Amino acid sequence: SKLEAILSQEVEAEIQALLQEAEAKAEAVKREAEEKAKALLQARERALEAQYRAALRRAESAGELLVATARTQARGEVLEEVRRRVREALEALPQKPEWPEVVRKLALEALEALPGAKALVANPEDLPHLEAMARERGVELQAEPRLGVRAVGAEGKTQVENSLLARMDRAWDAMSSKVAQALWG
Amino acid sequence: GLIKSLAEKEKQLLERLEAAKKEAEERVKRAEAEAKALLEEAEAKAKALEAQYRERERAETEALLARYRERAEAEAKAVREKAMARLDEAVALVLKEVLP
């Protein structure tokens, strides 16, 4: 029957269009993925690349802080040594053949700062030396505080002194600057 | 009269069309599976990437310390030595200020 023959070819020709519809609707699915994956893995390469350099920045920034400390660590080992030698130098002064000469220098120097003045102080490390302006001036030498000289004036008043080590903490603290340049010039 | 002819042929066609639509829809259910597989295994590739991103980072950051620290050991010493030489004078200056 040729009439239904045409119904076959027609229906069958419809089959051929359904399958093709599917194929393209599959190919687009296949290609939807190909892009979908490409677009995420690109995005996860990005995030990791930052997770690299910015990590390395904080690593590089660390090393400079270890080098900076390292250097500051070294300068302290030096600067403290220069401190000891100034102290050692001030502590080896008494047994040197130049110590009595210095004695009344600071004794007189303070004596000027206290114009009134009743008496003065000092160790047997020094005091005995005070005979020069012990004969002259006031003549009061009584007390014991061993590196430095003090004074008491206005009968009592505020008893002003002058410690030899108090000169260091001032003068060291001041031109600790001229010293650091002199060192690393 | 034959009725069946026109009423049976009318079935085979309908059930071949039925059969067409499904086997069609499977090819999509097939590609839908591949659509997952291609994503799952893309999740994998990137996972393997992280490895290198953390690992190469390890090896270089571990190396970066070596190079920086051994420059810390080097530069710190070379600043001691700079002082060492000129050191007598530092005291010479400090001692002179306090003396008078």
Swiss-Prot record, chain A:
Q: Does the keyword Transport apply?
A: yes
> Which keywords appear in this protein's UniProt record, sorted alphabetically?
ATP synthesis, Hydrogen ion transport, Ion transport, Transport
List GO terms (cellular component aspect).
proton-transporting two-sector ATPase complex, catalytic domain
Where on the tree of life does the source sit, at the highest rank? Bacteria
Read off the Pfam families from this record: vATP-synt_E
| UniProt KW Ion transport keyword | yes
What's an example Gene Ontology biological process for this entry?
proton motive force-driven plasma membrane ATP synthesis
One GO MF annotation is: proton-transporting ATPase activity, rotational mechanism
Q: Which residues form a coiled coil?
A: none
- Report the function annotation for this chain: Produces ATP from ADP in the presence of a proton gradient across the membrane.
Family the entry assigns = Belongs to the V-ATPase E subunit family.
Q: What is this protein called?
A: V-type ATP synthase subunit E
Name of encoding gene: atpE
